[PDB]
Amino acid sequence: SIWYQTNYVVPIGAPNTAYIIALAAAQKNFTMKLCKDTSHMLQTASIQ
Amino acid sequence: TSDESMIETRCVLNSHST
Amino acid sequence: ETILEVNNVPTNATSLMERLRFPVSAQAGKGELCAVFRADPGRDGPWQSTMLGQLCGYYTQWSGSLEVTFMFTGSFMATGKMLIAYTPPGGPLPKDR
Amino acid sequence: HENSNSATEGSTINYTTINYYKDSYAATAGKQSAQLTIGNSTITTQEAANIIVGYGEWPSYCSDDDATAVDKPTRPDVSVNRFYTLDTKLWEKSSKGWYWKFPDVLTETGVFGQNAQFHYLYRSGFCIHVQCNASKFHQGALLVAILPEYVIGTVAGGTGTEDSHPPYIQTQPGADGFELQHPYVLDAGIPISQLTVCPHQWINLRTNNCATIIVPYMNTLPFDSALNHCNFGLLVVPISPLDFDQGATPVIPITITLAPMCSEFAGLRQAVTQ
Amino acid sequence: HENSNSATEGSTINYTTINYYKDSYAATAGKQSAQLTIGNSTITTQEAANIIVGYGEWPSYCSDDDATAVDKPTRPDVSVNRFYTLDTKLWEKSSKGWYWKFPDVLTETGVFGQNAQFHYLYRSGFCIHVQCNASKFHQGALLVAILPEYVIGTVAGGTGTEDSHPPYIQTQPGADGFELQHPYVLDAGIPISQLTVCPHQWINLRTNNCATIIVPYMNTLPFDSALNHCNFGLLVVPISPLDFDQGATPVIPITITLAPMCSEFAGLRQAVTQ
Incomplete structure (x- = not known):
C-alpha cells in the first residue's frame, strides 16, 4: 500500500498532479518451479 | 538492490534450484 | 523491472x-x-x-524476494514523501498509514 | 547426468536405486544401505517420573539451512519463553477429556500473544506442564498427549451423510480448550488407544500428579501462522476415570501450564487476531 | 582510612581534595588533575546535511555495570527496533510548534507498545526522523530538538497565582503530540533560544527537508517505566515561520518517524497501559 508520508508538495507553475510508474521485478534469490501452462493469457479466437 | 539494504535480514541458506 | 500496472482500473x-x-x-x-x-x-x-x-x-x-521500483515522474520542483508499506500476509488492508 | 531431485535427496539415508532418466525422482524406490525455570516462571516436576521430550527433539530455534523467510525473526527469549498457565479444567467422574490447540491457547496471552498477533510467521516448540493434584486416596489416569496437526472431525450429522466441519470455537478453542465429545475417536475418527505413538505422558494419580511434555516445533514449514495453523493439539483425557470416596476432594482440577520454547516470530505487520 | 563514597568516585576524573573524615564525600570540592534501515523499515536521509547523534552517544544496550534489575531483559531487536511513523502535523503559517514525549508516542504502537505495556522496565534510545517536505519556493525553519526530561509547565492561571499542573493529555500526549501554547518558553519557562544545547537539528526548508536526531537513552536510571516516565520530549518548532506564495502547496506536513534503538524491556507482568 502506498501512503502519502508528508504530502505531494508543489510550488506555483509545476503540476499539482504527478504519476508514479511502478516497475516490479524479482531479486536474485528468486526462483520458480513446477513449470505449468499459463492462465494469464487465454486464447479465445482461433488463429487463422 | 538488496534486502538488507531494505530490512533487517536473517541468514537464509537458500538451496532453491534454477 | 517491468512496469507494474498498479493502476489497473481503466x-x-x-x-x-x-x-x-x-x-x-x-x-x-x-x-x-x-x-x-x-x-x-x-x-x-x-x-x-x-x-x-x-x-x-x-x-x-515461486520463492524469493520481489522488487517493486516506484519511479516518481513529476516535476523536479515537485517534492514529497511516500510511505510504501509491504504488509506481511496476515495483515488485512491497513485502514491507516 | 542426473538432477539430484528425489524426495530423499536431503535425507541422511543412502539409496541404491535404478534410474534411466535425468530426474532422481524418476528412479526406483530401491533399498536402503526438580524446578524447571524458563522466563520469569518456575514449575515443579518432582512427581512426573521423567519429562517427555517430543520425538526426542528439543525445541531449537530455526536452522538457517531450514528457514526460508529472509526477514530477521524476533526472539523475545524471556517475555514470550515462559510458563503460561491456562484456566483449569475440573477433572470429574464423567470427564470425557479436553483438548487444547497450539499456539491457539496462547495467541491471546502475554507478549507471546502479541508477537503471534503482530507477526505473520511464528515458530516455537512447547514445554507443556499438565498438572493434576489429587490425594493418595483419589484414583484415575490421564493420557496427557500431544497430537500434532490435531484436525478435529465432526459427528458428520451423526449418521455420516452431512459434511459438517467443526466451528472455529471447536477447531481453535483458545486458552479455555474444548471438551472431547467423543474421546474414543478423539473427535477425529482416530483411536485414543493409539494416541501414545504421539508424545504422551500419563498422569497416573497414584504415581504422578503432573505431566511435562516438551514439544518441538512440528511442521512441514520452518514457520507458520500462529492464528490459522495450529501445529499440535494437547490432549488431556481420562482413560481411567476419576474415582474417590465421598468426603475426599471432589474438585480435582487439571491446570495447563505452557512454556513456548525458543519462540521465533517473523513477518511483522499490524496486530491481527485471526 | 577512607570510604570511597564521594559522588565522583565512579567518574573518570581525578580529584585532589582535602579530607579529614573517613567519608570521601566529606572532602573538599578540590580541583581536577542515504538509506537508513532498522527493523523492516527504511527512511531516506539524503537531505539532512548530517544525522545528529544525541550527546555524541549511540543508543547502546544497558551495560552490565550500569544495570540494577536482575531479571533478564528482553530485546526484540527487529519487531520493536524499527521506524514508527506517527500521524502528521500540518506546518502552517501560524504553527506555534508541537512536542512529542518519549516513549509515550510509542507505548500504544506496535510490539514496542506491547513490550512497553507488558514490562515495568523499559530502556531504549531513539532514532528520530522528523521530515517536512516543502518546495524550493517554500520557506521556513524548524528547530527539531530533543529536550530530555521535558517537564511541561502551565500558564499558572496566567497571572501566576494558581498552582496548575498540566493534564495527562498535555504531559503525555501520545503519538498525536501536543502543540506548544507558548513555544518561546517551550511551555516550561525555559527559552527556546537556548534549546539547541539539547540535541537538535534544523529543518531549514531551502537546505534540508528532514531532520534525523539519534537519541540515546538518557536517564538517571538504567531502565524506567515507559508509561509514567517520559525520558525526553521531541520539539519540532517553527522558529522561522512557514511562508509561500498563494498557488504553492499550503498543506506542509511534518511527519514524525521514530525508531526505538536498542530497546530493552525488563519486569514482565500484565499489559498495563498507564
Whole structure:
C-alpha cells in the first residue's frame, strides 16, 4: 500500500498532479518451479 | 538492490534450484 | 523491472496507457492512501503486466524476494514523501498509514 | 547426468536405486544401505517420573539451512519463553477429556500473544506442564498427549451423510480448550488407544500428579501462522476415570501450564487476531 | 582510612581534595588533575546535511555495570527496533510548534507498545526522523530538538497565582503530540533560544527537508517505566515561520518517524497501559 508520508508538495507553475510508474521485478534469490501452462493469457479466437 | 539494504535480514541458506 | 500496472482500473482502450502509472496528487496532509496492490506476482491483478508475473503464469511455485521500483515522474520542483508499506500476509488492508 | 531431485535427496539415508532418466525422482524406490525455570516462571516436576521430550527433539530455534523467510525473526527469549498457565479444567467422574490447540491457547496471552498477533510467521516448540493434584486416596489416569496437526472431525450429522466441519470455537478453542465429545475417536475418527505413538505422558494419580511434555516445533514449514495453523493439539483425557470416596476432594482440577520454547516470530505487520 | 563514597568516585576524573573524615564525600570540592534501515523499515536521509547523534552517544544496550534489575531483559531487536511513523502535523503559517514525549508516542504502537505495556522496565534510545517536505519556493525553519526530561509547565492561571499542573493529555500526549501554547518558553519557562544545547537539528526548508536526531537513552536510571516516565520530549518548532506564495502547496506536513534503538524491556507482568 502506498501512503502519502508528508504530502505531494508543489510550488506555483509545476503540476499539482504527478504519476508514479511502478516497475516490479524479482531479486536474485528468486526462483520458480513446477513449470505449468499459463492462465494469464487465454486464447479465445482461433488463429487463422 | 538488496534486502538488507531494505530490512533487517536473517541468514537464509537458500538451496532453491534454477 | 517491468512496469507494474498498479493502476489497473481503466479497462477503456483509449485509457490503457493510464494503467502503467498512478496519480500522486496534493492531499490534505494525512496518511492518505495513494495506491494498493497485492504483492503476489502470479496473481490475477497488477502483476500480470510484468514479465515476472507473466513468467509466473508459466510456473506453479515461486520463492524469493520481489522488487517493486516506484519511479516518481513529476516535476523536479515537485517534492514529497511516500510511505510504501509491504504488509506481511496476515495483515488485512491497513485502514491507516 | 542426473538432477539430484528425489524426495530423499536431503535425507541422511543412502539409496541404491535404478534410474534411466535425468530426474532422481524418476528412479526406483530401491533399498536402503526438580524446578524447571524458563522466563520469569518456575514449575515443579518432582512427581512426573521423567519429562517427555517430543520425538526426542528439543525445541531449537530455526536452522538457517531450514528457514526460508529472509526477514530477521524476533526472539523475545524471556517475555514470550515462559510458563503460561491456562484456566483449569475440573477433572470429574464423567470427564470425557479436553483438548487444547497450539499456539491457539496462547495467541491471546502475554507478549507471546502479541508477537503471534503482530507477526505473520511464528515458530516455537512447547514445554507443556499438565498438572493434576489429587490425594493418595483419589484414583484415575490421564493420557496427557500431544497430537500434532490435531484436525478435529465432526459427528458428520451423526449418521455420516452431512459434511459438517467443526466451528472455529471447536477447531481453535483458545486458552479455555474444548471438551472431547467423543474421546474414543478423539473427535477425529482416530483411536485414543493409539494416541501414545504421539508424545504422551500419563498422569497416573497414584504415581504422578503432573505431566511435562516438551514439544518441538512440528511442521512441514520452518514457520507458520500462529492464528490459522495450529501445529499440535494437547490432549488431556481420562482413560481411567476419576474415582474417590465421598468426603475426599471432589474438585480435582487439571491446570495447563505452557512454556513456548525458543519462540521465533517473523513477518511483522499490524496486530491481527485471526 | 577512607570510604570511597564521594559522588565522583565512579567518574573518570581525578580529584585532589582535602579530607579529614573517613567519608570521601566529606572532602573538599578540590580541583581536577542515504538509506537508513532498522527493523523492516527504511527512511531516506539524503537531505539532512548530517544525522545528529544525541550527546555524541549511540543508543547502546544497558551495560552490565550500569544495570540494577536482575531479571533478564528482553530485546526484540527487529519487531520493536524499527521506524514508527506517527500521524502528521500540518506546518502552517501560524504553527506555534508541537512536542512529542518519549516513549509515550510509542507505548500504544506496535510490539514496542506491547513490550512497553507488558514490562515495568523499559530502556531504549531513539532514532528520530522528523521530515517536512516543502518546495524550493517554500520557506521556513524548524528547530527539531530533543529536550530530555521535558517537564511541561502551565500558564499558572496566567497571572501566576494558581498552582496548575498540566493534564495527562498535555504531559503525555501520545503519538498525536501536543502543540506548544507558548513555544518561546517551550511551555516550561525555559527559552527556546537556548534549546539547541539539547540535541537538535534544523529543518531549514531551502537546505534540508528532514531532520534525523539519534537519541540515546538518557536517564538517571538504567531502565524506567515507559508509561509514567517520559525520558525526553521531541520539539519540532517553527522558529522561522512557514511562508509561500498563494498557488504553492499550503498543506506542509511534518511527519514524525521514530525508531526505538536498542530497546530493552525488563519486569514482565500484565499489559498495563498507564
